[model samples]
Target: SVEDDKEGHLVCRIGDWLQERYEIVGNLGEGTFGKVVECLDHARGKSQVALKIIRNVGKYREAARLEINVLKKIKEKDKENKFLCVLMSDWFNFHGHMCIAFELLGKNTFEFLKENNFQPYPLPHVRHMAYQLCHALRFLHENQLTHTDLKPENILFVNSEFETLYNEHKSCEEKSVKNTSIRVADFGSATFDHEHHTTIVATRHYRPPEVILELGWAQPCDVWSIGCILFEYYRGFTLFQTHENREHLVMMEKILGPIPSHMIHRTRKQKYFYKGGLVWDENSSDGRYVKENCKPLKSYMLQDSLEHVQLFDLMRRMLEFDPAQRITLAEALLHPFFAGLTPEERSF
Candidate 1:
């Protein structure tokens, strides 16, 4: 009896009333879970909000419930919303679909990057974003939670308003966000420590070696993701871009050097290893792709300035192949890379 599209997505339209209170204004985005729409809360003096309408399916409904639970936990711990975590306003079952509401924010980091023509952010801007990200991750790790999927798409700016300025050096105009403040979003894949650990988590690009090797993962996996994110922020592209598993490992090896023999001995994915070394064809097309697409970790830096050197140093620690050796979010906050941050930037 519930209205749904052919794909089980809730059939909602502009001007539709949700829960006899929220008025749908427009579509925001869509994903496997379902669609998100901008809505006006009539009950709250027409306050703007983002409504996530989950598909009319049991598994998605269960996932939505889990996300709500995680959001509730975050809300409880960060009552003032100072941790840079997205705030969930409410959730309800409408027809056969589960719908959750969130405080409307600005465009996600990826979208901003795309709109800006893939131009990389300046080092200062990257530092600001990195500080906020580490702070948020520290909070999540402390609460026994891990944002398994941390990517540019999940990090949204609190205010995405940008100004276009002429770059004399580049001889072109560039866009810059007025406020670099960001919030972590999309908890549908967030996992608590007590919950079951899935063998696989995170998008392929942001995924860590431990997750890919099937060596089991936890909070350290999130740190690995943050490392990739920081690299992407500065480079204007993904660090590891391969669809195949072996190719991904090869790319990692190419950029970060050989995988430690101890980790190779422990991974459940043995097919990727051979005689204490990665089973890779150095002359194959995939190898060529890795060689051309990736360089040594330090070589990825645009400059050898002190800030850049310190930033890459932190990146190296976070990208550690061994989860045990990976830098914790708390320790990362104290790294020299963040030492030069202004008091205003360090406040949060």
Candidate 2:
């Protein structure tokens, strides 16, 4: 069972054997599954090491398992100076209990997002972040995978996104990593191309429109969330929020404007969609009218003219009107917005 302290950090139950195998360092992170305990490799002593943490059984292990497996293969291809958090091994009871062991991210993106006081960043830093994002997306795209839950909260700023960490207190080593490059993190809701039938996955605001409409969504869905991440990181607030299906539709219409006609025609779930407040009958006594349909919030979080202009321009593109028309990962990488990230590229 998942355990939590009053603060709500998930604490995973470690079997005595798992606990005995290594010295538990402290809490590294927590999520819906459980808290991750940092464990040291006793055999390697302190100098040489590997870190592994555990995750509890979740509702969709099959999908998570697919992401783990796919990531492991991609990690192999990008072995030298890897940017991604690799899946070394996993723990779980197939017929009974489940736990997983995988590579460690050391720290997650949330803490940093919170620590930075969340402001418009320098263009180079955003470029570095975008570079990391593109490579992670490239790896997933090439391997036929999709990280469905890509958010600032989901991204890890290590190597590519993580260059800031590598800034040397001591200069004996050459400086290579930039301050804000990132690699994709969190694979629980991630999907593979062959297993594309899932309708239920991803954090709501970061979810792409295709996923919302239950169309045959693909990696491009993640591309859309990348746009959402661009907004959140740039503004420190959610670009989308919804508590129910109707709320989801209403919010989408409000922010992105009435769904583009082409997209509406392409959506497979239209029959089940709520007309929401958009088409209320004027003759009904209690009916309400949505007189000014909410349009795409190009100015969603860019309320402050003080925010850096280039970034503001980029956020608009990330949040383009049509899902089908949104920028691809490669095309985005070439844009002048992320121009300076050519040198910090990583194997993954």
Candidate 3:
């Protein structure tokens, strides 16, 4: 039971790389999970990447074949993306469609964290957006997998004045921060868990904590979800504030507390049913199991934003409470907040 996830958002069209093996080119970036074109890899006939298709109205094909088997194991995922986004190729047809072929960025990370709120996005620009997402989460937690969807609109990079300064303001959320460089985009709702599996994909406020303890999870749950997607980009907002789970467990035990009564005995009864000790469970998937005006009944919880940030003492050690001691992705690529990346990006 893929938890019967549902949603609709696609209208893509760009066909034409017909096994002549590559030459489509154009339209790259779509979501709610699917469609990334811009191909042209005719056996390296000069061009190479771009072509992640994925669309299975036949119902999400096990979340798009677990993101094409987690990008074919990326060298046991010791991955090192220079600016990330790279799966050179993949295709499917066991029944109809499911494609992949990457290496095309040109912007994302929610339009570069809303262009870093009109100005100050320094600190090596949040270490170039958490250093290409620490090797795309060290190649998806080194193959055990779990991209269960990390946000900041899934991430992507490269600029060259990304399309002549995208929306030069007037409300492109005001605009500014663009130290671009991070690329890990929608892996459908990827999941290859070497084991951990209590299946609750993601999107209700960038969920994590074994998906709010529905239990089973792995890859230290994408390092507590890109460390809450780099604490929603250093305190602009959103740290598990998916509305009422008793105020999202009083904003997650008022900044990471309570949820450790022995990790609530490994998620007591699953489904919004936490029992006792470690709090939070408001019908688990909030907005009554998601969908219906995308849940956000207030409590965006800014918490006086931990009084302006030391990156909230390093996002409180990757929002801890033992997800097997979160922060892996090879020790978050040796973080001093990614001390200016590129040791092959601290080994992807």
Candidate 4:
């Protein structure tokens, strides 16, 4: 009963109506759960919106429902500012599949980077972006939620028609709302801070040390993700690019210093980093070896920035191995790295 595009991917053909409401214009893109389509909302003066269609599989349906619940609650809490994605309607049945509509948004940060050939952004641009993200985190934590996935792909701009703003303007900090506007998207991995949604979360590169050590996590887990994102914002690539957990820990120790002995002694993967009986195998090949030891952090981004010391200091706080000692979002907003960069558009 469905149709396919030239490439043979499923799509809602133009002029198709959903529940006798919006008219399907075309497909937006595909996601893990389903495809997002662009639609013309009849009630909103023919304005465009986005429709997320979840395949009828049981697990995918459950995940979509969970995201719906979180979005509903967050929309209510953020009714005034609506800084996050706006849920336009409740979940409804569409062809025996779960579907929800959201206000259409612009491309993600990852796409933006690709458009620019993955070059590093200016410090001012990175600064204001970080400031806005901190406020977004504050709002999420206030509502007792944690965005498990905070990668560049999940951060989106508010407008897409005006791509000229990003390409034409050299800096984004002082631009008008149309140029500088941004928001956090993709709540599929979001979880309530009080609950355990998943044992393994976050992308491998942005995954924190506590997660690797199996010591459990909370709000600070997101702090680690933000740190990684900022590092990428300036460095133009992931700060840690390993696949195995052991190598990931090695990189963490090299950049963030030792895993706190208290956490190390208690980890289930202790043998890998203990340095007592054997050197950890670098890969499945076991040809290379790495002995455990803390090393000083190193980077090239700070070579020119005047605030290199304060910037690294704040990065250290966010990348701390111990979650208990990691700085909170509030403290991070107050850090000198973000001191004068507080966004004039919103308050934390």
Give me the overall lDDT of model 2.
Answer: 0.56
Instruction: Please name the candidate that would achieve the greatest lDDT relative to the true structure.
Output: 1
Error of 1 at 277 (Å): 1.6
Per-residue lDDT tens digits of candidate 4, residues 1-348?
655443233456677887778789887778666778889988779888888887766677678788888888888787775555545565676655678888788777777766666766556667777777887887888788888888888887777443234544545422222344568877878899667757788999889988887878778888999888887776677777667787777777666666677787777876675453224554544224323322355554457555666666777788888888998989988888866454464453
- Candidate 1 lDDT tens digits, 1-348: 337777688777897898789999988788877899999999999999999998888898878888999999999898888999999989898877888899999899999999988899888989999999999989999999999999999999989999999989888888999999999999999999999999999999999999888989999999999999999999889998889899998888888999998898887789887787788887998888887788899988889899999999999998999999999999999998998888999997
User: Any runs in candidate 2 off by more than 4 Å, and if so which?
Assistant: 1-19, 47-64, 81-103, 116-123, 159-178, 268-277, 280-296, 300-310, 340-348
Candidate 1 Cα outliers beyond 4 Å, as residue runs: none
Q: CA RMSD for every model?
A: 1.2, 7.5, 18.3, 4.7
Worst 10 residues of 3 by lDDT: 1-10
| Model 3 Cα lDDT, one tens digit per residue, 1-348 | 111123432334455554567667677666544556777777877475777655555676556765666566652343443436555456564233466667665656566556655233434455556666766667565555667668777676655243223454433533443435555766656666554465576776767666665666677766677777776665555667565434454456555666676666666543443456433444645534333222332223233333234345556666776777776767655656454455653554
Candidate 4's displacement at residue 153, Å, is 0.8
TM-score of each: 0.97, 0.72, 0.32, 0.84
Better of 2 and 4 by TM-score: 4
lDDT, residue 243, model 4? 78
Name the candidate, 1 or 2, with the larger lDDT value. Answer: 1
User: 106, model 1: CA deviation in Å?
Assistant: 0.6
Q: For model 1, which pairs clash? A: none
